[PDB]
Amino acid sequence: NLSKFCIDMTAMAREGKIDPVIGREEEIRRVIRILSRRTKNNPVLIGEPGVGKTTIVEGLAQRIVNADVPDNLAACKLLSLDVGALVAGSKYRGEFEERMKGVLKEIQESKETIILFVDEIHLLMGLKPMLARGQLHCIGATTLAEYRKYIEKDAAFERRFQQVLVKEPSITETISILRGLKEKYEVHHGVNIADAAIVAAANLAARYLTSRRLPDSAVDLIDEAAAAVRVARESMITDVVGPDQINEIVARWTGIPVTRLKTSEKEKLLHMEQALSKIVVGQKEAVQSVSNAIRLQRSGLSNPNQPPSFLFCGPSGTGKTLLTKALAEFLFDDPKSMIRFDMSEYQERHSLSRMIGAPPGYVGHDAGGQLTEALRRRPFSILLFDEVEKAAKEVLTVLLQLMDDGRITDGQGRVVDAKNCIVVMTSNLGAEYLSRAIDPTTRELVMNTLRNYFLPEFLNRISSIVIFNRLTRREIRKIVDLRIAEIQKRLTDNDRNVTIKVSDEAKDKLGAQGYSPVYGARPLQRLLEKEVLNRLAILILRGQIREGEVACVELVDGKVQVLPNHPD
Amino acid sequence: NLSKFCIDMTAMAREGKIDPVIGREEEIRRVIRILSRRTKNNPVLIGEPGVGKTTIVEGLAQRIVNADVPDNLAACKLLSLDVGALVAGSKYRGEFEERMKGVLKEIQESKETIILFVDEIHLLMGLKPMLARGQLHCIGATTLAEYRKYIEKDAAFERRFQQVLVKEPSITETISILRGLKEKYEVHHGVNIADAAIVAAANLAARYLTSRRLPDSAVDLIDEAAAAVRVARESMITDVVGPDQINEIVARWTGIPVTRLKTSEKEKLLHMEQALSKIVVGQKEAVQSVSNAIRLQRSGLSNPNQPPSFLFCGPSGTGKTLLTKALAEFLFDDPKSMIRFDMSEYQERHSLSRMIGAPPGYVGHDAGGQLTEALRRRPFSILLFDEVEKAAKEVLTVLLQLMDDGRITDGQGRVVDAKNCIVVMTSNLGAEYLSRAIDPTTRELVMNTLRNYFLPEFLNRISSIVIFNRLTRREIRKIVDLRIAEIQKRLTDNDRNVTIKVSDEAKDKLGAQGYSPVYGARPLQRLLEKEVLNRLAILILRGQIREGEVACVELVDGKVQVLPNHPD
Amino acid sequence: NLSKFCIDMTAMAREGKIDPVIGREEEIRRVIRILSRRTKNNPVLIGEPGVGKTTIVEGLAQRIVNADVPDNLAACKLLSLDVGALVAGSKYRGEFEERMKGVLKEIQESKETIILFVDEIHLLMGLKPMLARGQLHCIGATTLAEYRKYIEKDAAFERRFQQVLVKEPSITETISILRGLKEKYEVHHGVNIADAAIVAAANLAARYLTSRRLPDSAVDLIDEAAAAVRVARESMITDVVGPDQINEIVARWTGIPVTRLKTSEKEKLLHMEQALSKIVVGQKEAVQSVSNAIRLQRSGLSNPNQPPSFLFCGPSGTGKTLLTKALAEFLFDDPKSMIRFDMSEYQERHSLSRMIGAPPGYVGHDAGGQLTEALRRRPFSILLFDEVEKAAKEVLTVLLQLMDDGRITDGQGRVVDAKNCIVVMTSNLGAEYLSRAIDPTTRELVMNTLRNYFLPEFLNRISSIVIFNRLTRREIRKIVDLRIAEIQKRLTDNDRNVTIKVSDEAKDKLGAQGYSPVYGARPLQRLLEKEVLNRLAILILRGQIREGEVACVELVDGKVQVLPNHPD
Amino acid sequence: NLSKFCIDMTAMAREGKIDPVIGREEEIRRVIRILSRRTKNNPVLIGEPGVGKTTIVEGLAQRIVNADVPDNLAACKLLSLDVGALVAGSKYRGEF
């Protein structure tokens, strides 16, 4: 028996050893149709890594062995290749090819019509199976990449193969197939599940694990997750899988407390400005506006195809970048979700390859376009593009393609999908009117400046064009108060606890200094940090300042100096 | 005997396993003739993917087997190795060349008259049987490009060969080819079809799926029909194929109602004004003008090789952009069928390289050809160009040499087809002559100030001469009403239902406001959108105007504002 | 039965033949969960070799035999595989392959469920146990490198498997392991120990960059030293192992003086500035800044993970290199701690990639990029960074990340951060701005320069910024005086021992001849060598000066000559 | 260590394979004090071709090796790089 590398799934059907799967049924009938297609019986699938496309094939074979398909196929048979154990059981070609030939005749002398499948089928190309004369029956499945690079290249294959593209799973239909596997899995150890828990878990892998992604793979991951959950429950403890544990485990996989996640994504929409003010202050109006706009996107009352768009028109120190990051965090629960891009790093036009990718005949195809790659990695994020006035107008047009539509394509045919992120932009090109005051006229005149800067349609993409304001004394004082709070935090990080006591005029002088004409107070932050921390730690380790005291931050002699309370 | 690599076509001829496509006899005659060419016996066929010139050589083999050939060719054995059949068993080029010799030994063994064929035969370049004086006979085919890449190089080989062009099959000929195939396939499936529906299908594959190539594509279609049958008939009585299933599949590959396909393409012609009005309003004169122009195009009474062209003189977006859009989505029935081109970037000579190309050894030539692949993939499309007068004069030169001839050279070295394109130049170089009201003088003033810009005959190959205007306040308000209508539509898209009640007062207000001498009020679209979307979504996420609750879009004190229905 | 070489660890457990190891319990529960599920029953241990890396499924078996394990898994029975024991049949797979064949079924003939251990199976395969579809239970112990090499490559491997993380058994936690193992090593060797002796042993072993991993070195050296003490005792002497013994043991194993084991590395960190001066002086701000910063990282008041980070400017090699080396010795008394890194090379991006590991393609798979290489091999080292502005921005971001306690996956995969390395960066051309004295003025311009050429947060997390001044006369004198004292000493190394007294005024002329406003302390050593060593050799081989003399050297006519005492 | 393209003029002096040139010695002091400067000590000689301005440069070096030096330039090394053959001989400017 030269089934040494194949076993019959249809047997397991007649042996009741494989469950069914749902979805793709129309595609199943598409398959069968092609299986009777005269010019090419043998189709090919295009599936993201190992969803269980196989399972689709076996549900097909199941309906078959349930006597429900055309006779030309109802009398057929299906094996399951181990392409590995062939390319691994033999040394190299020469005998691997010989084992092939050995099975082929047996296939050539199959007592009835039969089908095989080959996972990663492109393996055979990375030719020999040129005996396919119609009496042979196989299908394929891989990413568009391998299919293109190996089988799409072949003449006879093309003339004898059919793309069968599948698509990403969908939330509701997942929910369904989840309910489906629910029973068999509950049988697997004898405890049942909570429905809303499943719904949640699904949505958690949807909005989350945004790198560990879902050809329904991440679905099965939710599933094995629930499995581990019941195992914990296997170790009072009800029979149903509690949502609490769902959250605990998605956390233990990503590290976020459950509170940050059960916000309905709208409870946050009730206190966005709260959090932001708690972080950044100075353009509370811009805060409210951007919150409204992102709600529009989130409420979908706008075009459900134009992702949000924002440009900033102020200097740093105020919190612009601090805004961007705190925004993302409050909206995505991860700081690293930020992805930075410099238009100085893309003022070079030919860098479009590093931007999106390059044709395989370009040396830069070693990586491609890291931005598009992070896109492939990051559905849920916000994307940084600062000071475009130098950047290429063509990559700008690509940003457009994104904006008006929600996606672009690469250089290698691989289109992208960005229906879940936001573009953010910044400017500081209005330093002319930039003053400490409210004169929206000046704001409007800088707006005219930006209008004449570049293409008007580009403006017609930035919905709520927002501009900053030179930080008034009061808000500076507030940021310094938050600074001393940060210092007290860092102190309290351990049993080191001595009450910071900053003089008012100390802070006032600190700020009056720290307003750099350009760089903002971000330098002053680190400067005063050095100022304190140095003599602070000095008096700490030296015992000149000891625990349980008042860190009397004193601007003595018109300059901040950490006054100890004990000698050396 | 290493004759395995070839295949005796004449065998299956004897076994009758072959089914000849018909027509193209004269070409086969040409073949025979070159087979009598004592100088260069070996010809070379040249065609395109899909046409399977394999078909042709098989038909020649057919005329062999029935002894209906010139007896100088009677005993000739016609076989064909695959070059891939030797790319497989090759541990190195030497071993490649080893098997080459081995078979060639059997080959050079002059047992009886024998003739060979090789597909992609250029691949032998990248040869070994340059020893072939012509004591032997072979034949092959490939694209023009790699042929020029490889065979053009050697004097000997290129001289020994004869370049023959297969040519594109006639649509009427394809129907005849389908006929001869009909009974065969029907036997293969036990089905019947109406010849006329088949003709329709053919014409459909013609008008779409340009990715593929007739006729084998149309075959594929019929195969899919048989597939749907072999589902249905075996799932009163449903046994035959109507146009319905054809339509199902053309839709499944284009996503379009059979309505838009079951057209005959005459009523749409007779009623384009209807659709337009229901899309665009304000240039009825140009509407009917372009309508009759494209009618003349389809009438046949037009010049057989003069694709259309339409002058634009007016502000942008006012409908003319929307016009072009509607033109696409209604005539060719695809939005993307429009390909914009900003001549503002084509005011440079190197923009000729960037658009169509230049001699192959340049940097811009790779950007060029944007029209070439466009037409190849989209015959039925339109070519947008904006403010062309500023574009470099060689750009306008090559654009002309296209539009006149319906074909233009490219930097790659070829002249594309354009028999289904439409020329579009767009600007408002004299629109400022006008008020909100039509005077032929300002019209004639633009006539002069534009015919001057070039050869007025360069403007006199344009299919027409067309201007625009500044919309009447009343029809301004009309397109406003259109807007608010699509906005109420967007409202109804989500289950939140609220009645847009745009007061004629607010109507006039917004209209006049956004009405600007630059683009009319196209930016006002987004302006009023901000005016409404903002407030409505505010009250949506605040809980003020509930479902159904009115949105009286009313102008209060010179500032339109929706009265909050229920204050917070 | 093929119980030839496997080991059912249930026996070793029941008969107590296993020592109770503690630590890493989460992994125990988690792998239990892995065993329970249906999709990925079998995990694999990922990690470099180690007693802990080995003694894992042991403690699992112990929790098993103690009946504190899942019931559905309680029935299982331990097992393990021995590669070297089974492969003893032949050279290649061969009968050893048939040995694996014979043992495969053995679980099928196990009515009671069994659980096996097979590490390194990826070597045993990269195919056989494709039958692991629900019929067996096993685990392996390997590394992520070899995992990606063999197992990750097969999708089915994943589809049956997951990973596990054993990355870092903490230093204090390795000490805790040994705190438990105290009594066991006692009853083995029959010798008490002062726990703190083993503590410090482990601490220094950690400071000592051995290929042995953190607990690996611990078990190894502690148990061999216990064997040494137990054999020395039978041949005062109490059972308590002497701490001094272990101190000198490790001191000689590394070759570093036991003096490092003294000084507590605390007071030497308080009086560090003494040594700092005693190498080079003239920049009090340097010594104070860096010493207080390193004490700060030691005191943990700052971020307790990233070590302090420094950037400097001004002169070149005038002591900055000297500073690097001197500090390397101050911390660790070892030159190899210093690691060179040159930014003149890494201007290129592929240079960056090669500096950070190596993909399997595009480059030979080296163990890691020279930088990442050194980081992986040696965690107690010096991170030099010269003229970093020469390099490109991407590696700048890399080093930002690293400074912030960051780490990046490498070719081997493991991320590496400077857990105990010392980082520093350099700028230039400040001194040219720095006029004679230190001013405040120039430092503002140069710090703003640093800002506007780089990233503000990138300048954050940097300890401080210290610049120097062109060397004065006093300091020139001192540095050259100590230099020539070193000269005298290193020639005294040579048995020829003449004393050296030179004209301090000729020394003044010497330094003025030597010091440059550009290269400072770099050339003078060369100059002194040139003037001195050959004079010495000529005089000694000349007899004009022999031992017991004074190497009097005096300036004469702008020339300073080593005046002899015994002319020919 | 690609000094291969450059010759240690100072060595050649100490090698003594050179010819002691005279005249323009005040110019020697000129360029000497120039090199003593810190403002901009890197001068260019206004030189008509064919004057053997080379000979001048080498006279400079020769005096340099022999205590005829402002002590700041005690052990500076005048060397000689064939800039011409270096630049023009490169068929591709990248290697250049």
How would you describe the overall organization of this protein?
The structure is cut from a larger assembly and holds four copies of chain A. The first copy, chain A, is of the alpha/beta class and 568 residues long. Chain A is elongated and about 100 Å long. The longest helix of chain A has 20 residues, at 473-492. In chain A, the strands form three sheets. A four-stranded parallel β-sheet of chain A has the order 4-7-6-5. In chain A, strands 2-1-3 form a three-stranded parallel β-sheet, with helices on one face. In chain A, strand 6 (381-386), helix 18 and strand 7 (421-426) form a beta-alpha-beta unit. Chain A has three domains: 6-165, Rossmann fold (3-Layer(aba) Sandwich); 260-467, P-loop containing nucleotide triphosphate hydrolases (Rossmann fold, 3-Layer(aba) Sandwich); 473-562, Helicase, Ruva Protein, domain 3, CATH 1.10.8.60. Chain A has 23 helices and ten strands. Helices cover 46% and strands 7% of the residues of chain A. In chain A, helix 9 packs parallel to helix 11 (217-234), helix 10 runs parallel beside helix 12 (243-254) and helix 13 packs antiparallel against helix 14. Chains in contact: A-B, A-C, C-D. The A-C interface holds A 49-50, 82, 84-85, 88-89, 119-120, 185, 188-189, 220, 223-224, 227-228, 231-232, 234-235, 316, 342, 345, 366, 490-491, 493-494, 496, 519, 522-523, 526, 530, 533-534, 536-538, 540-541 and C 29, 32-33, 36-40, 70, 72, 125-127, 130, 154-156, 158-159, 270, 292, 295-296, 299-302, 304, 362, 393, 447-448, 451-452, 456, 459-460, 464. Chain D: Belongs to the ClpA/ClpB family. Chain D: It comes from Thermochaetoides thermophila. Chain D: This is Heat shock protein 104.
